[PDB]
Paper text:
[name]+ T cell responses to IAV, mediated through recognition of short peptides presented by [name] class II molecules on the surface of antigen-presenting cells, are essential to multiple anti-viral processes that confer protection from severe symptomatic disease during IAV infection (Wilkinson et al., 2012). We focused on the [name] class II molecule [name]-[name] due to its high prevalence in the human population and the pre-existing molecular studies using this [name] type (Cole et al., 2012). Unbiased epitope mapping of the entire M1, NP, and PB-1 proteins revealed five IAV epitopes that elicited robust and reproducible responses across multiple [name]-[name]+ subjects. As part of our structural investigations, we solved pHLA crystal structures of three conserved IAV epitopes used for clonotypic analysis ([name]-[name]-SGP, [name]-[name]-[name], and [name]-[name]-GMF; [name]-[name]-PKY from the F11 complex included for comparison).
Fine mapping of the T cell responses using shorter 13/14-mer synthetic peptides based on in silico binding prediction (Andreatta et al., 2015) was used to isolate five [name]-[name]-restricted epitopes for further analysis in four [name]-[name]+ donors: M117-30-SGP, M1129-142-GLI, M1208-222-[name], NP302-314-DPF, and PB-1410-422-GMF. The more immunogenic epitopes in vitro and in vivo, namely, M1129-142-GLI, M1208-222-[name], and NP302-314-DPF, were less conserved, particularly in swine sequences. Although M1208-222-[name] and NP302-314-DPF both had minimal numbers of identical sequences in human and swine, they were highly conserved in avian strains, at 86.7% and 98.1% sequence identity, respectively. M1208-222-[name] specific repertoires were also directed to a single TRAV gene (TRAV38-2/DVB8, mean = 50%, n = 4; mainly coupled with TRAJ44, TRAJ45, and TRAJ49) and to a much lesser extent a single TRBV gene (TRBV20-1, 23%, n = 4). We generated peptide omit maps, observed density maps, and conducted atomic-B-factor analysis of core and flanking amino acids to confirm that observed core 9-mers matched those predicted by NetMHCIIPan 3.1. Subsequently, inspection of the starkly contrasting electrostatic surfaces of these epitopes led us to look for sequence enrichments in the cognate CDR3 sequences that reflected simple biochemical complementarities (for example, opposite charge or shared hydrophobicity). At the simplest level, they included measurable enrichments in total CDR3 charge or CDR3 hydrophobicity, which were clearly complementary to the surface electrostatics of pHLA crystal structures (highly acidic surface of [name]-[name]-SGP and highly basic surface of [name]-[name]-PKY), as well as the hydrophobic central surface of [name]-[name]-[name]. For M1208-222-[name], the LxGxYN motif was partly hypervariable in origin (LxGx) and partly germline-encoded in the enriched TRBJ1-6 gene (YN).
Numbering used by the authors:
A (entry chain AAA): 3 to 182
B (entry chain CCC): 3 to 18
C (entry chain BBB): 0 to 190
The structure:
Amino acid sequence: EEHVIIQAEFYLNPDQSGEFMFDFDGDEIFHVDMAKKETVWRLEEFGRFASFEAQGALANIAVDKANLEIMTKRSNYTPITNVPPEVTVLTNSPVELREPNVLICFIDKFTPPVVNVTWLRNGKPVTTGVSETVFLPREDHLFRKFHYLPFLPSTEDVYDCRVEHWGLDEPLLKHWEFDA
Amino acid sequence: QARQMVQAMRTIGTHP
Amino acid sequence: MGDTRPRFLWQLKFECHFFNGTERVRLLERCIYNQEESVRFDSDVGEYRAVTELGRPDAEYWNSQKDLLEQRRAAVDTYCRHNYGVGESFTVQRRVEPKVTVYPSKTQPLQHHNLLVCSVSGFYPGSIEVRWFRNGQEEKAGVVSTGLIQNGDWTFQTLVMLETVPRSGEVYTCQVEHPSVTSPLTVEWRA
């Protein structure tokens, strides 16, 4: 098989969370921001070569929500079983002291698509320059997500990704430091 | 320029 | 978080499967309740089929709408082939050359042994070959890969470690073949 393009959407109750995205061979092409009602391209350059009418995605989500309510009743109100995430922290490239790099927090194999992710530097929450993806689909119908923290490697600083999910007994920490 | 449009499949109502 | 209320999830997936560009196209439309696929349209079959009892009422209701079945049947062209031509230039044709680095692991777990790392960073697409050579003979024993790691930003990384026994008179070469370059990338390490 050369390639697979997926249009993946979901609605989640009672969170009232809707998502609409396209995937190519496991990478996001774009998603629609439900609040701003606009197409957000994964790489800015993609928006130079294609366009998408976001209102189409908002109408699909209204139908998906209406259908979740039917399916919820038809199942005799069978709720989802929580599957907790696997979490990995690694850098975008080999670390060199005082050379800019990016920490990646990879959150995988979970459902439902609700997670609270925090970065810590030397035990304290940090938000400067952070970014994240939307929830990305898997063939087993679980989800993936990535969070990113740009940083200047030092021997002084240590980092953690903190992940909260309803399937976990306790919030998880995944630690990273550069030693010696 | 002439816009290259991504097309969405339309979701449809389930059996009521 | 102490929010213990039950959750209910509905997912829809429209999968366009391409074989030899747009020569063979298969559309799979999939409805998933919670984590269970209930009903689907396969363009090879040409109508909706229930995959669980939950989906029966939808396969019956949808299969009896002649124009919906027509639109879905044509979608392989109006949707899959259309979107493939719009996206082809920046997805199918995307090529990004790896950065290759060789260094001793900051962690040495095995005595009398130097663990060498070949780092291959920032490449697209996923298909890649990483091989170790010692004075130009290929080394296959003592090789350990992370395999392919998706960074989530349309790049991949992989780390391929070699367990070595250091000798005088040796050059180790990491060789990388990738569609983004016309001949292989090489990086040498010497004691």
